[PDB]
Design a protein around this nucleic acid. Sequence first.
DNA 1: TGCTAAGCGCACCTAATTTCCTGACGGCAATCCGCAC
DNA 2: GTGCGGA
Lengths: 255, 325, 321, 332
Amino acid sequence: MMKGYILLEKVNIENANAFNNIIVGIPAITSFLGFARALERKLNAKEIAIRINGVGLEFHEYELKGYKNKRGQYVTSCPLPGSIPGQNEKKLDAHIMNQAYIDLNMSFLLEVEGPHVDMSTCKSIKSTMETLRIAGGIIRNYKKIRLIDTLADIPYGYFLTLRQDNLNDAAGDDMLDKMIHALQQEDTLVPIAVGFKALSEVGHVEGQRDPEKDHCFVESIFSLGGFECSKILEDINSCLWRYKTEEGLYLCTII
Amino acid sequence: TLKSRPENLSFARCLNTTEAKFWQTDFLKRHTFKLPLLITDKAVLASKGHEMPPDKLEKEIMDPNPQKSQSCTLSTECDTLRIDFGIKVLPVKESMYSCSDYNYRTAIYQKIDEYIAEDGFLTLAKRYVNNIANARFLWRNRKGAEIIETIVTIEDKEYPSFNSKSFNLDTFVEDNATINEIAQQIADTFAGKREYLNIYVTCFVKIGCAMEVYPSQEMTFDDDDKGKKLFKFEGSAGMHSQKINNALRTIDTWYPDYTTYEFPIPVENYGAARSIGIPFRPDTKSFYKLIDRMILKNEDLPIEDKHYVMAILIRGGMFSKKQEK
Amino acid sequence: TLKSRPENLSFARCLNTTEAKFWQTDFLKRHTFKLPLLITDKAVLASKGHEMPPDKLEKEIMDPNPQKSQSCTLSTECDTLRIDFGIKVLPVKESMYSCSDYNYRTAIYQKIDEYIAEDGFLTLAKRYVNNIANARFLWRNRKGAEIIETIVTIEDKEYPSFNSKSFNLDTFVEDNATINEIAQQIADTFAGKREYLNIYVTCFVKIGCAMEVYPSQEMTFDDKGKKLFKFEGSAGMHSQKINNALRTIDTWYPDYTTYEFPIPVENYGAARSIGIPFRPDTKSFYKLIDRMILKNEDLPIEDKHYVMAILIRGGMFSKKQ
Amino acid sequence: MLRNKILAAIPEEQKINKYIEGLFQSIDKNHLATHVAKFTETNSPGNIGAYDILSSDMNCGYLDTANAGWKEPDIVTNDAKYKRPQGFVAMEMSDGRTVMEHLQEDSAELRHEMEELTDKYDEIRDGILNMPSMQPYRTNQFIKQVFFPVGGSYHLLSILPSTVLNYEVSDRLYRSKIPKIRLRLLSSNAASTTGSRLVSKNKWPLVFQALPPKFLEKNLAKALDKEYLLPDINIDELGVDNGCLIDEALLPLIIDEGKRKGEGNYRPRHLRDERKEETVQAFLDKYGYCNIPVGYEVHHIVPLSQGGADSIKNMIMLSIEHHERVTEAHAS
DNA sequence: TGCTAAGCGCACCTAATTTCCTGACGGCAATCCGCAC
DNA sequence: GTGCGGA
């Protein structure tokens, strides 16, 4: 019954997950969209009807936990492991698996659709964001939660957008060769993770987190992305990530 | 009747801490002035003084040993160190992110409500505020200091300060008004009567003019370089959040043999402190056996074991049944 | 009841020394006037005078050799070098960073308490103040000096000065009142009767006008030239070089009556100067600490002096199994 | 040869019996896989994984395990004890070929060499040529489980990592110039615990680097621009009556403090703290007046334009005639 | 409290050659493995 | 409470 835009401005996230089996860097888009969905689910239990249908991701600064060597390469750092459940839980030294962590400052543009979208909604989002996480990281501080109307009320930064056309129109003989060639031609693009693909059928197995839902075994899928500034942008709708679900595919796309 | 712990149970931290950033100051101008502190590169020439087999000792006793390192020191015009971090407190019953069985959820919620009824999270909160009052988050930066001063701010109210050299690291005080007033609010946040609490902690340590500050050291695995690497947070020196939290959880004085060893240990699932290589709670007073005696075979425990179980649930972790294939 | 050393044993320093900063003054106006000293960039042309194989020597004997370097000298109007550093003294029973067995901790604490019961850390502390009094931390800046004066300040009391060209470098004085007065406070800090002590040291070296000053050089690891140490923009010295010059207090090695000189305190007694290891099998630290704690034997007092000197120096002393 | 080899890998005859006897008791415990579970946490009970042999698309917009060109499958067990087959099918023979390629064609080159060293090459070859596939049958606490919204409700998804894709990113990035990162966290013993051939061969993989552009990286310069200075004088006991500077000689003190602090720190507008009216409200409270005593103006002793905090401390109320003095001196 | 409005700021040509750029010794010890018997 | 098994 009404539609608007809410901006979450300059949020500090400390120690967010940065490993997706072929990528070390920016976290996957599904974590940010799940943060938006978790905020939606927590606002609807306080009897405040709202629906978040699109999120835009803006970047201001980053820091990867580690250091840069003299040759210009990164060496990651991980915390010291503690007690882990299993057969060797009573030991003093535990195992070291594969992990990576990142630090971010970002801003979020949320498209909300509900019966009322005033500043009391902004106060409720301010009261409901001090009990949530982004990726697996904690929120130290935010600056201000406010409503926006046009492109000129947005702070300066660089947004992330999908560039699937630059991947389907390149090289050949397999998709990974297209990925490597497209990354060698234009140097301002990054590989990102954009959702999941099925590896089995839907059913019920033993050992689930919730034993009353449907279950599928999945694999992560990867695509290409790029950065555009906030003063060279056309429309709000061309930087908003949304959910899309086919049969066997769970994705995140910019229509 | 319930027979085993559920197949998926998980908890989250209720005391979340942020990273610390270091500064240099002067003590008589410590409320107006601050300078950045940076890490430098140091390379040394040494001698081989490790224990070697007698064959290698005859060949390598007099050989040079260059190594690489890093260091952090104050300037020649500043004499104090300033440490600033922050803590977020969240409720206990809203920190269960997974529970497969519904009856175990009901039973554990009833047990936490009965713990709110008798000693509503006040003793544990008093111990956590004490471990902010004696400044145990200074690990090697507490040795050799003339004045240690700690200030705690909640919301927009600055509380009166602490002299952190007047508290002993082995006794817990329960008669200070400021500690009691912070502990009541942390108890109310733990008990559900509030929903979030934000604490800001600032510490001033006077060590001397050009003295050595000891930052946190990183665990990195590279083959070309093998040297000491220290933490750099936004260009300056700092300490990890995990270090400050271990210091805060050193509140356990209820292990089975405390009359022989009379120091408090950190709260862990088997009493495994990294200082002593023998676990302190290995079979009968462990977390799994006490929570299987509290919930699954309904029985009243002594209050110290309840204190330990609730402190483990504030710490967090993956607490589930042995996974079968 | 104790077999073996614990799997994680380490100690921490009880004499923490700061880095040194260098200044230039005049001797008659040294209490009211100090100027900064800086490092300059030099480049020199040379001749090929290194030893070469006979074939290459016939082709590369009259060839020029450009090289890069660095240097530090005083000005034309200044004649005195001023070096400033500081020392922090910490107790010895509270310098134990890691021990994985409680019984070994109790045994070590009992032997240190027996040491404080016989000699209250006084001989070693007198040797440490003696190495401040003769200015052994001036390594190559001590050759060719007219007057050397060293002042020691603790708190807000400036102790009377020292003439560092009247102390021999091979003998230790035990009759000087100022040395005894500082050494008693250092001994009380080592014992545990006080929690810390901060000592600041200032030294004046008259060497003349426009003469050379020798700072510390930085270590290079790959494939290099001469780089000198800079501390806050000025020249200076490493803390390790000063601390090595304050630990040359060992005169208890087995073959001291032949070579009558003090050596620095290490685990196997290795002298880099004179190329002989002096404590290689039976009087090393490992055998003595395994014959003191693990078999309860009363050693002579000189071996106890060596063991407590190593435990004031610090290190990693861990056994595998 | 496959001779000396089967000995290096430990009389000299009971030996060759031990290897081949130990081999046949384990060729029914090795399965084939493209996705394995203990590559995330090696404490996952069982042999849970998958074999995805499906069809490519080549123009879909996304990379997967079926759109890339994986060339070699993977062989996986549950316990390291049982891992001889993966070594056995890895020993290179005389022609620089792998037991694998010879067992698919049966060139007698092997036919001959095995039959002198064993009596059961027939049974072994059938158990390396028809191998069972890995099946996903259950889940545990060590496999990552997440929720995903599907049409008014949710689906629970368990993510399994890809072993064949990790091996082919690392080979195709060792000969390339795009940014990459090497992870050196897995040891040799823990790699064997995973049970896969491709992880015990590549235990320190090479992966993609995906970072924001390099003008947006934190440093000390972009951290001293979010802090603000405060003065070194407390007016409350300092020549001043109720906030107003009575002594004309104390003006130079304000000029020298403003000259000292915030001298060479110019900050553009975007980098300046706002000027909220509450602080000049809060300053007056301490001294009353309910109103600015006209003929006086609030001056931040440290310009909020050369770096200064918008705080009660960083202001002092001075006369307009005095104010014309200070705003010109600090401008100059 | 006010301190100007307009226009414009060259065309040419070039920027050296030789010889060489060190010899030594060395670059840590500890720990980070599930599983079937 | 042991010892296996690879790269």
